[PDB]
């Protein structure tokens, strides 16, 4: 079984998963790799949205088998400051593209060699086999080289050419002229007119020698449109000078009006591709797929410029015929071969760029979710609810370790609310929770949080987003962990766990691709490729897991946290589960982290990759566990650098190197009691002396091995702030600032004249038609304008996000 060798091999689990297996480099193919990656992944795209660093990163990844986290987090001096974690991820992604292109090039080179052998057995390949195949810097021009090969040599797997050659300026020369923008190669006259040469070749397929002229022009057009140089020049022309024309289809004119997303570009005219926004072209292509819109990509001319080259000057009247034939051959080639294919290529590139922006937006949103810290374990009480109309509210007190301790149900109306408040206060007094979190669903969250505040002040109370809790509730894992609890109780535990630490909850509830895709990272998330979006999200998870480090001894004791050691560097689903299985079977919990290889069977390369990103809670151990404890194991420091720590501590204590009493362990076990002593050590002078001894540059590593001994796994996440009023508005309302289109038409229900007209929106937002339109402050009520109770649809003219109030319009003139 593949899983068996994957768990048994010595390479990172994520290295075997990739389709293109990681094969070593040569330092000459590696340099070409770096140049190609730098040129292609760091080139300006078509829509508005150091090489030694790439060389070092590629060398690490492909020869040292260092995962992107281990390069980012322990190889900074090699890649920084010009390469970061996401840059390393992009480099490793583009390595796959380089390998694919190289394999394609090798296959095509072998084909061209076999074809050369076959021809030698019998045009031919003299420098094209070298010039083209060797000079293939993209998959697109690889198609240009191959398809050009198929045009001529594709016939043989084991006479219109006469006219085409008698057409002047052989296609390679036409490509040269186009690339130079001037007639580098002159045309070749003939001592006759096209028809006379036509009589020679007009025999069976093309009688009526005009037909042989048509055939010859078609052959010339094929040869021109298949020429790699003409392909390059025309693709560049499309890239720089490309317009986007859009019109709505019969199905599109009617159903796209100020609310369909394609309204802003329902009609376009000469919209340059350079001005396409982040995801605008993705929306354009989605609208075109829906059949309510039609587009085309062109430059309008360019044909007039091109025709000047494949042409001759004199007016002999026997070259005007040749000139006209050449002009119309170029016309046909451009109109039916080059324009269409170049439009297809440009459309694919633009759509892929829009997809990439959408994926990046989803990744950034996930980053913001996972980069939100814990709160300041802690006993967290989580309150969750629903419409609340004949539906109770559940609050769950989740222990600091993350395990729910107990729950409480909180189901004329005034006395019932009073009794609920009394029982909630009783619960809070009995079991004091550090933080009370209220889920975010609607306006009722504000009232719930305010009541909780009124209770607590007689200890914080914070509103919490409710979107991962819903996914947890609907998931089967919630049923598995809590067979007795109702769904709303699952929401409370999810909210408490997320507030305690989002990463630990996001990884546990987003256990599969389907679960992660349930979340809403971006409106167009559903249209991007599933593989790329999933890879981006898992890369964000890996980054935040390695930048946090996963505490081993807690993932075992509390199996809720097991999901975190999937995203550890070096240590994957199979590898992580195998490590957990080994720990469980041995019935032993890591007193020490160099113990990984000692008690488990994980290879040198995996240990190197993973072990920097595993935490050991050395302050929590006691009883029989006191028997064996390596004190450095409680930190971000890794067992290749454990000698430099035990020198840095000795030097910071000014221990006499000549005293047999300089115990380097005891020096650390004094520095980890008094970390302020490490401030008196000159790390730059210490690093220069390590470099002189031949240990290499370690300046940045020593600053980490200091900052880490100053605080064991120093958390860098931004603290759990309370959401800004904008956050509350977009959370409880469940729509974004873009969704609140000032001037949007909304169906609202009128409730009652408190001097204005209170209209309740379906979005849970109060709508106040202004008295200006109402025209009655002390005058008779606005009943004449509209009857109270029913629903009307109007247009927004103002917003009150801090109060959940939005202006409306009564006049149809505003509606227009």
């Amino acid at each position: 079984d593949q899983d068996n060798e994957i768990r048994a091999t010595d390479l990172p689990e994520r290295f075997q998963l990739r389709s293109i297996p990681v094969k070593g480099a040569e330092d000459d193919e590696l340099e070409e790799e770096a140049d190609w990656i730098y040129r292609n992944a760091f080139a300006t795209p078509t829509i508005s949205l150091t090489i030694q660093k790439i060389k070092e990163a590629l060398g690490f990844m492909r020869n040292q088998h260092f995962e992107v986290p281990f390069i980012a987090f322990y190889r900074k001096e090699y890649v920084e400051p010009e390469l970061h974690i996401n840059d390393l991820w992009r480099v490793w992604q583009w390595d796959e593209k380089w390998t694919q292109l190289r394999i394609r090039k090798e296959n095509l080179t072998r084909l061209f060699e076999k074809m050369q052998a076959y021809q030698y057995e019998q045009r031919a390949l003299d420098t094209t086999d070298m010039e083209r195949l060797k000079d293939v810097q993209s998959m697109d021009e690889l198609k240009d080289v191959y398809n050009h090969f198929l045009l001529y040599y594709g016939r043989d797997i084991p006479g219109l050419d006469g006219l085409a050659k008698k057409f002047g300026l052989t296609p390679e020369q036409f490509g040269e002229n186009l690339r130079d923008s001037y007639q580098r190669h002159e045309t070749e006259q003939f001592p006759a007119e096209p028809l006379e040469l036509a009589k020679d070749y007009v025999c069976s397929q093309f009688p009526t020698p005009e037909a042989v002229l048509e055939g010859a022009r078609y052959m010339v057009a094929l040869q021109i449109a298949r020429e790699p140089l003409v392909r390059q020049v025309l693709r560049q022309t499309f890239q720089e000078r490309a317009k986007l024309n859009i019109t709505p289809t019969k199905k599109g004119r009617k159903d796209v009006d100020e609310a369909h997303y394609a309204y802003s570009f329902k009609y376009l005219k000469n919209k340059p591709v350079k001005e396409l926004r982040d995801d605008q072209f993705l929306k354009i292509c989605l609208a075109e797929d829906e059949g309510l819109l039609t587009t085309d990509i062109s430059i309008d001319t360019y044909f007039e410029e091109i025709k000047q080259f494949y042409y001759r000057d004199e007016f002999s009247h026997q070259v005007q015929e040749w000139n006209r034939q050449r002009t119309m051959a170029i016309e046909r080639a451009l109109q039916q071969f080059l324009y269409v294919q170049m439009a297809k290529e440009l459309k694919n590139k633009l759509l892929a760029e829009a997809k990439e922006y959408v994926i990046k937006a989803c990744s950034r949103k996930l980053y913001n979710w996972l980069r939100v810290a814990p709160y300041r374990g802690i006993r967290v009480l989580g309150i969750a609810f629903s419409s609340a109309r004949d539906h109770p509210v559940f609050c769950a007190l989740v222990n600091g370790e993350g395990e729910v301790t107990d729950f409480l149900r909180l189901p004329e109306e005034r006395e019932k609310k009073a009794q609920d408040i009394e029982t909630l206060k009783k619960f809070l007094l009995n079991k004091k929770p550090h933080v009370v979190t209220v889920a975010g669903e609607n306006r009722d969250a504000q009232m719930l949080i305010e009541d909780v505040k009124r209770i607590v002040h007689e200890i914080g109370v914070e509103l919490v987003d409710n979107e991962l809790a819903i996914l947890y509730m609907n998931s089967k894992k919630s049923e598995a962990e809590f067979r007795d609890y109702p769904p709303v109780l699952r929401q409370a535990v999810s909210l408490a766990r997320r507030i305690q630490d989002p990463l630990i909850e996001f990884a546990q509830v987003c256990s599969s691709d389907e679960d992660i895709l349930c979340l809403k990272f971006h409106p167009l998330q559903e249209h991007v490729v599933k593989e790329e979006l999933l890879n981006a999200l898992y890369c964000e998870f890996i980054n935040r897991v390695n930048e946090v480090g996963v505490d081993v001894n807690r993932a075992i004791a509390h199996p809720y946290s097991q999901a975190l050691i999937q995203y550890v560097c070096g240590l994957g689903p199979r590898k992580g589960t195998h490590l957990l299985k080994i720990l469980k079977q041995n019935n032993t919990r890591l007193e020490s982290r160099t113990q990984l290889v000692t008690m488990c069977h994980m290879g040198p390369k995996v240990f190197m990759n993973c072990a920097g990103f595993l935490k050991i809670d050395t302050a929590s151990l006691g009883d029989s566990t006191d028997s064996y404890i390596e004190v450095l194991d409680g930190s971000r420091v890794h067992p290749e650098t454990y000698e430099w720590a035990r020198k840095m501590a000795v030097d910071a204590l000014e221990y006499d190197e000549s005293a047999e009493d300089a115990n380097p362990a005891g020096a650390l076990e004094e520095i980890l009691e008094n970390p302020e002593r490490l401030k008196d050590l000159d790390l730059d002078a210490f690093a220069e002396e390590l470099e002189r001894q031949g240990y290499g540059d370690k300046h940045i590593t020593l600053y980490d091995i200091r900052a880490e001994l100053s605080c064991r796994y120093k958390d860098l996440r931004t603290a759990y702030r309370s959401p800004n009023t904008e956050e509350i508005f977009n959370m409880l309302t469940k729509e974004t600032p873009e969704t609140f289109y000032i001037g949007k038409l909304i169906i609202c229900n009128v409730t009652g004249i408190a001097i204005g007209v209170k209209t309740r929106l379906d979005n849970g937002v109060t709508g106040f038609i202004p008295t200006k339109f109402l025209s009655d402050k002390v005058v008779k009520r606005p009943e004449e304008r509209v009857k109270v109770g029913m629903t009307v649809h109007c247009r927004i003219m103002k917003i009150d996000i801090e109060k959940f109030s939005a202006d409306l319009t009564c006049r149809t003139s505003d509606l227009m």
Binding site: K647, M648, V650, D651, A652, E654, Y655, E657, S658, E676, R677, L678, K679, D680, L681, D682, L683, D684, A685, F686, E689, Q693, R706, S710
Partner: peptide, 16 residues
């Protein structure tokens, strides 16, 4: 004998 010490000669002021 063969010996080395990281020098406490540092002018960086104990990181405050």
């Amino acid at each position: 004998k063969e010996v080395y010490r990281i020098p406490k000669k540092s002018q960086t002021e104990k990181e405050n």
